[PDB]
Amino acid sequence: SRRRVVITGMGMLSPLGLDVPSSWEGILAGRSGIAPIEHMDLSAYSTRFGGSVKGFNVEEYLSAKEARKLDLFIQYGLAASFQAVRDSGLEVTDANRERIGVSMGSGIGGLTNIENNCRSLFEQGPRRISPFFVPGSIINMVSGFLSIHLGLQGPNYALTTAQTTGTHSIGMAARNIAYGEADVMVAGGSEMAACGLGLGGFGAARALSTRNDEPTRASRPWDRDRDGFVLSDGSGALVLEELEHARARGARIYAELVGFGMSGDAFHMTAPPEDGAGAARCMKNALRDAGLDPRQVDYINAHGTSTPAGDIAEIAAVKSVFGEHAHALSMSSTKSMTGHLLGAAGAVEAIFSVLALRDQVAPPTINLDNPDEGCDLDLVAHEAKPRKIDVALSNSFGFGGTNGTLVFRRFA
Amino acid sequence: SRRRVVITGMGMLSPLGLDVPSSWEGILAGRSGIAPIEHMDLSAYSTRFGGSVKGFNVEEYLSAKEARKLDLFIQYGLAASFQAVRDSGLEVTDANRERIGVSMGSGIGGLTNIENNCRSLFEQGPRRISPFFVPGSIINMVSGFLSIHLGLQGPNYALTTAQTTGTHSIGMAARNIAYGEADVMVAGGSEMAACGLGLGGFGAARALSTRNDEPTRASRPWDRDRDGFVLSDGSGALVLEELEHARARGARIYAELVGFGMSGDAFHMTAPPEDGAGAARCMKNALRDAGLDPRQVDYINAHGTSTPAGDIAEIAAVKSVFGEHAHALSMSSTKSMTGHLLGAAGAVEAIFSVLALRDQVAPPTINLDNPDEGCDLDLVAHEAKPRKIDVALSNSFGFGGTNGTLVFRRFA
Ligand SMILES: CCNc1ccc(C#N)cn1
Numbered sequence A, B: 001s002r003r004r005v006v007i008t009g010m011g012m013l014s015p016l017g018l019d020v021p022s023s024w025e026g027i028l029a030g031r032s033g034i035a036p037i038e039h040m041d042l043s044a045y046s047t048r049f050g051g052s053v054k055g056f057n058v059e060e061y062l063s064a065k066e067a068r069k070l071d072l073f074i075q076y077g078l079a080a081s082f083q084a085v086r087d088s089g090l091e092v093t094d095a096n097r098e099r100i101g102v103s104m105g106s107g108i109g110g111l112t113n114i115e116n117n118c119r120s121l122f123e124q125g126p127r128r129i130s131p132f133f134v135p136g137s138i139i140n141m142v143s144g145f146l147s148i149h150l151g152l153q154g155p156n157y158a159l160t161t162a163q164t165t166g167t168h169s170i171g172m173a174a175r176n177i178a179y180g181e182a183d184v185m186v187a188g189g190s191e192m193a194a195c196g197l198g199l200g201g202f203g204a205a206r207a208l209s210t211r212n213d214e215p216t217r218a219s220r221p222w223d224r225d226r227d228g229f230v231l232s233d234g235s236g237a238l239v240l241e242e243l244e245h246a247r248a249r250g251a252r253i254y255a256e257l258v259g260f261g262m263s264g265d266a267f268h269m270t271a272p273p274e275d276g277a278g279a280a281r282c283m284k285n286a287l288r289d290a291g292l293d294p295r296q297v298d299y300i301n302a303h304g305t306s307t308p309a310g311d312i313a314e315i316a317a318v319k320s321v322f323g324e325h326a327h328a329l330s331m332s333s334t335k336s337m338t339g340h341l342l343g344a345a346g347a348v349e350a351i352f353s354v355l356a357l358r359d360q361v362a363p364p365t366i367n368l369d370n371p372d373e374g375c376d377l378d379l380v381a382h383e384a385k386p387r388k389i390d391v392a393l394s395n396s397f398g399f400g401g402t403n404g405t406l407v408f409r410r411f412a
């Protein structure tokens, strides 16, 4: 038998807000976080908009000196992690610090820092590269700096599974707790790829929406006029905790994490199979891991990136898994509002899945004006839908065919 | 209920050879793979040598058409993975493809490709960034492309824990199999950080040996004249397999993976504590996981980076864990010959640990002319030492204070 894992703290930076409650208020109001990117000449680029974090104040978390040493993606991941640990009320002590670990990941890591140090290198040669370039740019430094700041001595690692990062990070942290390797994990992801290389690199793959005239309408999952994803920035962190540990200290418990599934499509480097066979296997694995029948699912936070092929694969995968129940559940893409936070997508969406359980409401898929051929599910078009939600899934289907599904259930 | 995990296939590119047996021949002969770097002009750099892979032929593995799209770190990870799968004798079928996954990690991933695309962006503009820039550079695409080529549909992920990556990748792949998420995993790491940004970045941190005039003597773990690590390139991959699965198909078993430990130092972004307290915690976790008396440990493949603080912290940790038995075991750093393969270090060193068991020989620590203060263990100075080895430990320690330990033992 395995131990039970619950969520006792959450933290976030998103295009909708500088914390969880601000972000969630935006989600339930159908607000878009997408706008023209500022303080950057994107004249030469095919996409000039995305989901920026607005008004982030790193000196709430770090000294100016420690912030200068760290890429924005690390700053964001530390902000969400500190928020999550504060929200949990956990007291770190000599008696528990060996039982508290971190798994905060990133899809792309420190592209901004790499770009600025390429400039130094090409213009002035190697002797002007910053001394803190390597440790301030590498993906495992959110887990590193968080563990140093809070004295965490448990499992310390970082996933990098592209757009699946935040989902895998939370799932694997849940395994650490369930199998007795930790009692508490801080888990999630962070991303800041809005630099020349990010907008330019996704742009060169023609993966991005180029709807520059109407950025708030660009991200339109399952809409027949969708033309690729919207790049966004931010972070999500959850405090995962063994159930008896949480009860013994009187923790507030948001929800229980009952299932985690993984699969590989083994199909294509960037596109999923048309029928979403891999995503279907992954959801089936997660439900098996939770000991739940597909009929018990009420709400799915889709991957829903606004790509032609990805959006239709998810509809096929949900029809396959859920059969006669596929229309009864509600499925929405909060990327319609947040855009695609890449490695942090699964983390902010796990938080939105937990809050859908707390508040008994399916967030909307905004901009779903004209559902595409076969997109006839309950996709919660336009407006939030209050409803019964006992069991909520959150899916991530990323580059490389790598799939993750989390299953959350109401706790009482 | 927890299943046993064995090693049935291994694969490698290192500075000593283009496969496992050629690399291992070099290890036992005390050969250095370190030389001045030829692939670029390093006259402006403070370090101009490293451990390059010599004469890699990607056309043993992939069409030149597909190779052209992939960072060297991906080509190296795929080559090592293909070697390991062939070495295992495993046949991928519809009956087992859902039960075979991959966890191949990297510390930095496609830095060369990032630098080359940054040069396009700065010199020409975003329109000259390669459409393959993202899928050909991001760390999870060894796992992604390997799954596409071989049809692996099991857990598909990638770790990035800096210099601990390969050890964490193998340990957490072993947990997938041990606890029933997979029956087979291909696990390890790959790295090719020898570009201007990499050599420049580690150079700016003053982390590298600057022994340009005698590169084969630069890597000198525990030697009083050491002056930092040597940067090296390559890959290690192992096929991990559930024991009954291996027995059922008549697999050749090299050794059993009995223990894995993780810990965080929670000390410093880059420096290990002088007492090795985090490394001691990690080794103790691994030995308890393996159900061992510490006196059963015969051979330790140290992290042994050739840094002043790293090498002495490892002696302190080994003396703390093993007490008087610390004088009976043999401990060596194969980085003395290979240099530091960063995210691939733990993968090639796990392979060297398995071969130490197969051949009953402790590899040497070359260049250990004058052991430093307190470096008075059996460090296998200069020459390979045949000896009884039932249990072998492989240690890794990385930036962010992240530690991993693998425990292997002979399989009867
Ligand atoms: C060291 C030679 N071993 C090899 C070569 C090619 C492949 C493939 N594919 C697998 N193993």
Ligand SMILES: CCNc1ccc(C#N)cn1
Pocket (backbone or CB within 6 Å): A172, A173, A175, A176, A179, A181, B172, B175, B176, B179, B180, B181
């Ligand atoms: C996250 C490392 N720990 C793990 C991994 C997988 C499983 C399973 N099943 C159990 N523990």
